[PDB]
Every structure is written in structure tokens, then in C-alpha cells.
Design an enzyme around this catalytic site. Sequence first.
Site, PDB file in Angstrom:
ATOM      1  NE  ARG A 175      -4.003   6.034  -1.819  1.00  0.00           N
ATOM      2  CZ  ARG A 175      -3.860   4.710  -1.863  1.00  0.00           C
ATOM      3  NH1 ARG A 175      -3.928   3.982  -0.749  1.00  0.00           N
ATOM      4  NH2 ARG A 175      -3.662   4.114  -3.031  1.00  0.00           N
ATOM      5  CG  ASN A 176      -1.409   4.852   2.626  1.00  0.00           C
ATOM      6  OD1 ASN A 176      -2.386   5.393   3.127  1.00  0.00           O
ATOM      7  ND2 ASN A 176      -1.504   3.844   1.773  1.00  0.00           N
TER       8      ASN A 176
ATOM      9  CG  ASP B  22      -1.982  -1.111   1.134  1.00  0.00           C
ATOM     10  OD1 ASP B  22      -2.904  -1.013   0.297  1.00  0.00           O
ATOM     11  OD2 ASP B  22      -1.862  -2.080   1.927  1.00  0.00           O
TER      12      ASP B  22
ATOM     13  CG  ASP C  66      -1.641   1.821  11.700  1.00  0.00           C
ATOM     14  OD1 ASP C  66      -0.956   1.321  12.624  1.00  0.00           O
ATOM     15  OD2 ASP C  66      -2.671   1.288  11.239  1.00  0.00           O
TER      16      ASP C  66
HETATM   17  C1  LIG Z   1      -1.439   5.639   6.678  1.00  0.00           C
HETATM   18  N1  LIG Z   1      -2.378   6.625   7.230  1.00  0.00           N
HETATM   19  C2  LIG Z   1      -2.509   6.698   8.558  1.00  0.00           C
HETATM   20  O1  LIG Z   1      -1.856   6.038   9.353  1.00  0.00           O
HETATM   21  C3  LIG Z   1      -3.536   7.715   9.073  1.00  0.00           C
HETATM   22  C4  LIG Z   1      -4.599   8.044   8.233  1.00  0.00           C
HETATM   23  C5  LIG Z   1      -5.572   8.963   8.621  1.00  0.00           C
HETATM   24  C6  LIG Z   1      -5.487   9.568   9.875  1.00  0.00           C
HETATM   25  C7  LIG Z   1      -4.452   9.223  10.725  1.00  0.00           C
HETATM   26  C8  LIG Z   1      -3.447   8.310  10.342  1.00  0.00           C
HETATM   27  N2  LIG Z   1      -2.459   8.010  11.219  1.00  0.00           N
HETATM   28  C9  LIG Z   1      -1.603   8.865  11.828  1.00  0.00           C
HETATM   29  N3  LIG Z   1      -1.713  10.213  11.721  1.00  0.00           N
HETATM   30  C10 LIG Z   1      -0.850  11.074  12.277  1.00  0.00           C
HETATM   31  N4  LIG Z   1      -0.955  12.406  12.107  1.00  0.00           N
HETATM   32  C11 LIG Z   1      -1.936  13.043  11.442  1.00  0.00           C
HETATM   33  C12 LIG Z   1      -2.538  12.565  10.265  1.00  0.00           C
HETATM   34  C13 LIG Z   1      -3.564  13.275   9.630  1.00  0.00           C
HETATM   35  C14 LIG Z   1      -3.986  14.510  10.148  1.00  0.00           C
HETATM   36  N5  LIG Z   1      -5.028  15.242   9.480  1.00  0.00           N
HETATM   37  C15 LIG Z   1      -5.462  16.564   9.986  1.00  0.00           C
HETATM   38  C16 LIG Z   1      -6.939  16.858   9.653  1.00  0.00           C
HETATM   39  O2  LIG Z   1      -7.193  16.606   8.275  1.00  0.00           O
HETATM   40  C17 LIG Z   1      -7.079  15.215   7.991  1.00  0.00           C
HETATM   41  C18 LIG Z   1      -5.684  14.654   8.287  1.00  0.00           C
HETATM   42  C19 LIG Z   1      -3.388  14.981  11.322  1.00  0.00           C
HETATM   43  C20 LIG Z   1      -2.360  14.259  11.963  1.00  0.00           C
HETATM   44  O3  LIG Z   1      -1.744  14.684  13.099  1.00  0.00           O
HETATM   45  C21 LIG Z   1      -2.208  15.987  13.485  1.00  0.00           C
HETATM   46  N6  LIG Z   1       0.152  10.597  13.011  1.00  0.00           N
HETATM   47  C22 LIG Z   1       0.300   9.291  13.197  1.00  0.00           C
HETATM   48  C23 LIG Z   1      -0.564   8.376  12.622  1.00  0.00           C
HETATM   49 CL1  LIG Z   1      -0.330   6.666  12.869  1.00  0.00          CL
END
Ligand SMILES: CNC(=O)c1ccccc1Nc1nc(Nc2ccc(N3CCOCC3)cc2OC)ncc1Cl
Length: 258
Positions: free
Chosen positions: A138-139, A134, A152
Site C-alpha cells: 500500500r506504500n 512501514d 513518502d
Molecule cells: C506512501 N504513500 C504515499 O506517499 C501517498 C499516499 C496517498 C496519496 C499520495 C501519496 N504520495 C504520493 N503519491 C503519488 N502519486 C499518486 C498516489 C495516489 C494516487 N491516487 C489516485 C486517486 O485514488 C487514490 C490514489 C494518485 C497519484 O498520482 C496521480 N506520487 C507521489 C507521492 Cl509522494
Amino acid sequence: RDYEIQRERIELGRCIGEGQFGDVHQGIYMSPENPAMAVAIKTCKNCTSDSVREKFLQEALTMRQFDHPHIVKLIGVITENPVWIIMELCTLGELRSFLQVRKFSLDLASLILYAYQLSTALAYLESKRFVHRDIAARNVLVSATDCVKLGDFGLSRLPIKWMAPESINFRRFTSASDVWMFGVCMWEILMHGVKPFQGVKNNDVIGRIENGERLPMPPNCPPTLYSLMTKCWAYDPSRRPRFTELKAQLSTILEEEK
Ligand SMILES: CNC(=O)c1ccccc1Nc1nc(Nc2ccc(N3CCOCC3)cc2OC)ncc1Cl
């Protein structure tokens, strides 16, 4: 050692996303005589059975396996209802938005650095024989202006426009098909978060790839870096570089660009 966290150490903040099982929040992990640590919290919304709770927690067991500066770390779990998984927070959010918003503030050296760092995370996975499946901009999360991390793995999860032909045609997923996807992820990065094959239908994608079409060279991408990308997109998996090769090459290209 012990991944179990007391729920009273967690303060749930705003919703930042969603996955298969429930909402994802930002929050804080508190501990005596220490500063509060920013965390992401995956919640299992209405998980009212052992089978769902077990499927949810296996995502934690997956992340627990890895220890790398450019992959998000598992902090711990809360195994009483409602079950939460607690991960390190990447405070600047999702890479695609970051690149779009900070475009007139970022230079090529920064974009190449993001590709290098990600290549080190993927070489690490390759050495463990773990296939991501994946890999897409976007990830990828932004930890600091000079630091990106694979997000994650549960939350990362058909992405036709990113997939190797062997994955589309035969459902084969290998480190070599990972290499293909990474090629696309590097293109996304150099294009400041534009998606691949925009305006093209999923079912038409394989027709174009088998016809030999590839994503075009981004503006101001170095020819040497586009050449490395086209190698990632060899139709034959055997002809693509390994992530070990990619990391060495990207290291050289980055040094050249500084
Ligand atoms: C692979 N994608 C992910 O792990 C994941 C997807 C969507 C939301 C959270 C997410 N995982 C994390 N996200 C983050 N940090 C993020 C991610 C997205 C955001 N957003 C802010 C608000 O609009 C949408 C996305 C904030 C944020 O920290 C403030 N830190 C650690 C992890 Cl494990």
C-alpha cells in the site's frame, strides 16, 4: 541547496489522499523555459502553531536525506502559511490498485522486477542504518509500468499483519524486521495486491505466526522465489537474509524469468 519554492510556481490539482496533517494533492511545478513537472503536494490543513508546522516539516527533512531511483524525491518546501511539501509525483498511483487493474496485462517478469527494484531501495536504506518500519504494498507507488518507488515515509505511517514477531512482541524494529515486512510485500505483489491474512483478526495473527504458519505460495510464483520469502520469515531475526542478499537473489530470479 535551497529547498524553498515560491508558491506561484505550484498549481494545486486534485486531492489524491490524506495524511496526519492534511490533504495530499497532485499538482504541477512550473519554472521558466522548462516543461511543467508533475508533483505531489502534502498540505498542512489547519496548522496554526509552530510545533505542528515543525512536526510536519520534519517529514521533508527525512525525505531530503535520501537519493535513490526507487524512493520518491523531495523537490522542495513552502514554509509560509499554509505550509506545503512538494514531492515528485508517481503518475500511475498506488501499486495495489495498479496490480488489480492490470492483472491480465502483466507478466511474472514485471512482478519480479517490482520486487527487485524495491529491494535495491531497501538495501540502500539498510546501508544508511535507516529502519523503514512501514513496508507494505500500500506504500509502494507506480512511476511507470517498469518502475515502482517507496512512497513518502510520513505518509507510509500498528500494521500487525505485516510485522515481524519481535516487533509485535517486543517492539523491536530493525533492518531484519524490515526484511520480514518485505517478505510480506513480495507476497502481496505476487498475489496481484491481495492483502495478507484476509479475514483474520489482528490479535490472532501472532498466535498463527508463533504456531509456525506462513502465507501460502502464490499461484505461479517460482519455487525459488517462495523459498526466498520463507527465509525472510524466519522466526529468528538472525536467520533472515539481509537486503543486500535479497537484491542479489532477486536479480538472479528475474534474469531466470525473463
Ligand atoms: C506512501 N504513500 C504515499 O506517499 C501517498 C499516499 C496517498 C496519496 C499520495 C501519496 N504520495 C504520493 N503519491 C503519488 N502519486 C499518486 C498516489 C495516489 C494516487 N491516487 C489516485 C486517486 O485514488 C487514490 C490514489 C494518485 C497519484 O498520482 C496521480 N506520487 C507521489 C507521492 Cl509522494
